[PDB]
């Protein structure tokens, strides 16, 4: 009976190596800890959340410090389109002289890594111009991390531990987070843009030294109080404006130009200022909706439980029984975590889709590797958050969901027709899958037989209509914003479409990623993505809705979220747990982000090389992808090192093979299962005991093969790590190689 | 200041792992 883990007497009394593995896996699952109460659960979680914030601010500090210290920010300012941003210094004893020479790049004195995170672009846009400013940012963020670490410690101390009632006070948190955390943060940022970024963009040095003396606008806050707000839109930055200089600069702090700054090919700062100011006011208003301590405000529990629509009786909100939903949400942290992972996962994809098409950072649109890195990064994060949302949704159903408390509501009804939901998801998946693979294989065969005019090429006419409805006149449809006669285009009464001139210039220039021209190749791959999204959903929803039980295992809720199986009886029950749907879904989540990022990257490679034809003609058959994307763009990557020598892509060439190795290693844990290994380890235990000098030393923990579930964890990890590093290497090497 | 890399990278590479794995090993085997 060992001490570790302190949180499990079951694991602490395990005499095998499984004790060590299961302690790692269960360390952060505070609900499953021995003698855990609800109050102690919330108080530990709250303190931990301060720990995580601190880590984020220490991470953020690292980026600033390493660039301030080892980067070329001040050099990069002077020529952002030609200078390569430095991430950090390389100090590796294992490097030979050829490698040191190869990594001595971007005008560095020693070997350095080129940054692909776009932090230089971001920091430059928001008004930072010196390594001293970056440094001061890093030291501030250390102290800000320090403040949260102390807060975390303080709120664990007897007097400062919040009550459970305090944690369940939903309406107060919704007011404070909408108005304060969102609204005031947005207003404060609008303040930063107006007081610092916009001046710096116009060659005016504004810092802590002189920001109280220097007014953001000549008029100086008099028009704001008198209500002559239009003064702040007067004299915008001209089309001739050269960023970070007074040449072509304006005085306006709140414009509404639409489209991009023509030099930087990014959103106008004065638009981004007015956005964050407008957003702030809307959020401050929104966070005055819920009642706290002053009588006024909506009660969410009352809104859910309401059964009357102005005298007329209704089943509830929208004539749908939502009774007990407030308590379900408020009382189950897995319901919340799941729900909030869904929302964050959607917003992460939202960010990714918008940051490439509408760049906000000066010159980032021309840093092709950074754009490729940032899109792939956020789409991969979005995919994890989305899988987590469903995972924690299944954990809620199996651990937290009370059928009696949710009697007759929307959640009970969803569970009542779960077979109908899962069967229709199965159909949409199969329907998409058969026909999409069908059309690709059709195209791939008729092209192979030297008849590419026999391909099934479907114009994405509905998406093209949306582009035309946004005023892309390429398609010649003449509807909504592409029709100058339309009330949409003119805004018939008010004529306040002041966004539109800038917007139409941006969307009708072919020099940006704002509503890229789409064709048959874009149709087939969007339908592959749909297939991907529906099938990942099918696996996760089926996993969630069968988490509590099925025909095969009616009492599945008694066994919890994660368990190996229910044994080989009843035909066999491998991968029957709700956890095993999460495990299966992530393969599909990764497959789907693969298709999304491949598509994003190959379309953009064409656009960046001024060869859209390549994608447009070859993307309609899967040999085109195989050859013109994977094979073609592997050329430089795999020559990162060779018999003739090394170049700066040697590290990506090595990481590329590392990814391939870690992926393949994952297959071992996923294919070969425990019984084989336990029998092998038995012979190793025999051999050790019988070896004459080695049997001197003895294990404290009995060697055992990894558990059935652990093998799926370890297998899926190796697979995932392999997937990410392989593509990261290829994506970066192939883009940075060409550019 | 570059000399700090010659101190910190070996410490994070060897000293910190040895110290961390030594302690964690002694902690997980404590009865």
């Amino acid at each position: 009976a060992t001490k570790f883990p302190k949180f499990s007497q079951d694991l602490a009394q395990d005499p095998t190596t499984r004790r060590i593995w299961y302690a790692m896996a269960m360390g952060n699952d505070f609900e499953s800890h021995d003698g855990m109460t609800e109050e102690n659960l919330y108080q530990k979680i709250f303190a931990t959340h301060f720990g995580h914030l601190a880590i984020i601010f220490l991470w953020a500090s690292s980026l600033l410090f390493h660039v301030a210290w080892q980067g070329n920010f001040e050099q990069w300012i002077k020529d952002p389109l030609h200078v390569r941003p430095i991430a950090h210094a390389i100090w590796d004893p294992h490097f030979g002289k050829p490698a040191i020479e190869a990594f001595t790049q971007a005008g560095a004195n020693g070997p350095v890594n080129i940054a692909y995170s776009g932090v230089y672009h971001w920091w430059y846009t928001i008004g930072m111009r010196t390594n001293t400013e970056l440094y001061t940012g890093s030291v501030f963020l250390l102290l800000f991390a320090s403040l949260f670490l102390f807060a975390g410690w303080l709120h664990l101390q007897p007097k400062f531990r919040p009550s459970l009632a305090w944690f369940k006070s939903a309406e107060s948190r919704l007011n404070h987070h909408l108005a304060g955390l969102f609204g005031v943060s947005s207003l404060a940022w609008a303040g930063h843009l107006i007081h610092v970024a916009i001046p710096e963009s116009r060659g005016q040095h504004v810092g802590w030294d002189n920001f109280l003396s220097t007014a953001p606008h000549p008029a100086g806050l008099q028009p704001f109080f008198t209500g002559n707000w239009g003064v702040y839109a007067q004299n915008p930055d001209t089309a001739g404006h050269i960023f970070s200089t007074s040449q072509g600069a304006g005085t306006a702090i709140l414009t509404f130009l639409g489209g991009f700054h023509p030099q930087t090919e990014s959103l106008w700062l004065t638009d981004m200022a007015h956005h964050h100011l407008a957003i702030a006011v809307l959020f401050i208003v929104a966070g005055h909706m819920y009642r706290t301590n002053f009588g006024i405000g909506h009660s969410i529990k009352e809104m859910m439980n309401a059964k009357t629509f102005f005298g007329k009786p209704v089943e509830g909100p929208f004539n749908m029984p939502h009774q007990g939903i407030y308590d379900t949400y408020n009382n189950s942290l897995h319901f919340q975590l799941g729900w909030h992972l869904a929302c964050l996962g959607v917003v992460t994809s939202w960010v990714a889709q918008h940051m490439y098409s509408l760049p906000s950072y000066a010159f980032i649109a021309k840093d092709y590797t950074t754009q490729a890195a940032l899109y792939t990064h956020h789409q991969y994060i979005a995919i994890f958050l989305m899988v987590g949302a469903f995972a924690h949704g299944a954990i809620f159903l199996v651990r937290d969901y009370d059928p009696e408390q949710n009697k007759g509501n929307v959640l009970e009804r969803v569970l009542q027709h779960k077979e109908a939901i899962i069967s229709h998801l199965s159909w949409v998946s199969l329907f998409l899958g058969f026909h999409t693979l069908g059309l690709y294989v059709h195209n791939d065969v008729v092209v192979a037989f030297g008849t590419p005019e026999k391909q099934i090429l479907i114009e994405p006419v509905f998406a093209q209509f949306i582009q035309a409805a946004h005023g892309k006149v390429l398609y010649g449809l003449d509807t909504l914003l592409s029709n100058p006669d339309s009330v949409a285009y003119t805004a018939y009464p008010n004529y306040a479409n002041v966004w539109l001139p800038g917007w139409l210039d941006a969307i009708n220039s072919g020099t940006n990623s704002l509503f890229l021209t789409i064709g048959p190749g874009d149709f087939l791959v969007h339908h592959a993505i749909a297939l991907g999204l529906h099938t990942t959903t099918l696996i996760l929803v089926k996993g969630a809705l069968d988490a509590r039980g099925s025909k095969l295992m009616p009492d599945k809720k008694d066994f919890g979220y994660a368990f190996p199986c229910d044994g080989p009886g009843r035909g066999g029950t491998c991968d029957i747990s709700a956890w095993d749907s999460f495990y299966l879904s992530l393969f599909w989540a990764l497959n789907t982000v693969g298709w999304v990022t491949f598509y994003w990257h190959w379309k953009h490679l064409g656009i960046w090389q001024g060869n859209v034809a390549q994608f447009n003609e070859n993307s309609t058959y899967l040999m085109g992808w195989f050859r013109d994307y994977l094979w073609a763009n592997s050329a430089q990557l795999i020559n990162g090192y060779n018999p003739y020598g090394v170049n700066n892509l040697s590290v990506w060439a090595w990481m590329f093979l590392f990814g391939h190795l870690v992926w393949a290693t994952g297959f071992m844990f996923l294919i070969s299962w425990r019984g084989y290994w336990q029998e092998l380890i038995e012979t190793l235990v025999w051999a050790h005991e019988r070896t004459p000098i080695a049997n001197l030393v003895r294990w404290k923990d009995k060697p055992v093969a990894l558990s059935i579930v652990q093998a799926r964890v370890v297998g899926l990890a190796h697979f995932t790590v392999g997937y990410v590093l392989t593509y990261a290497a290829f994506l970066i090497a192939s883009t940075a190689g060409k550019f | 200041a570059s000399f700090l890399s010659s101190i910190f990278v070996p410490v994070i590479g060897w000293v910190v792992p040895i110290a961390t794995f030594s302690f964690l090993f002694l902690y997980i085997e404590r009865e």
Partner: peptide
């Protein structure tokens, strides 16, 4: 780039969240 002094201040300032991270970690273990 930044001076050797500034690097040494940053390291000394970084001992503060280093200490408080230790105190939080030990408190969270209880």
């Amino acid at each position: 780039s930044i001076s050797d002094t500034q690097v040494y201040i940053a390291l000394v300032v970084a001992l503060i969240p280093g200490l408080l991270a230790w105190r939080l970690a030990t408190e969270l273990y209880k």
